[PDB]
Ligand binder design. Sequence first.
Ligand code: K23
Length: 85
Amino acid sequence: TLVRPKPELLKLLKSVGAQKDTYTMKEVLFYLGQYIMTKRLYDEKQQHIVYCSNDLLGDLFGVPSFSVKEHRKIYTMIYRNLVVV
Ligand SMILES: O=C(O)c1[nH]c2cc(Cl)ccc2c1-c1c(-c2ccccc2)ncn1Cc1ccc(Cl)cc1
């Protein structure tokens, strides 16, 4: 169960200190959430709405925001930026 992020997500994954170029999703999802945390994309008062508008992540995901409860939506959006080895 492995993927190669497409370059733009790979750059985003490296900005949160990823060292590889081919990951498990788990590792992808992990660095993503870390990115979300470290770029302050969450709303502290909505508590699981990620506001990715006006940020590389939103450009990758093609959406201004999403719930972390929408597992499929997010999986879909991630896989657009991936290539399964
Ligand atoms: O646990 C993680 O590493 C994690 N990684 C993520 C990546 C994204 Cl793109 C969205 C949510 C999470 C996410 C996450 C969060 C979260 C919420 C707000 C800020 C930071 C993290 N809450 C639960 N999760 C787990 C998770 C994993 C996959 C999916 Cl599809 C949804 C939620």
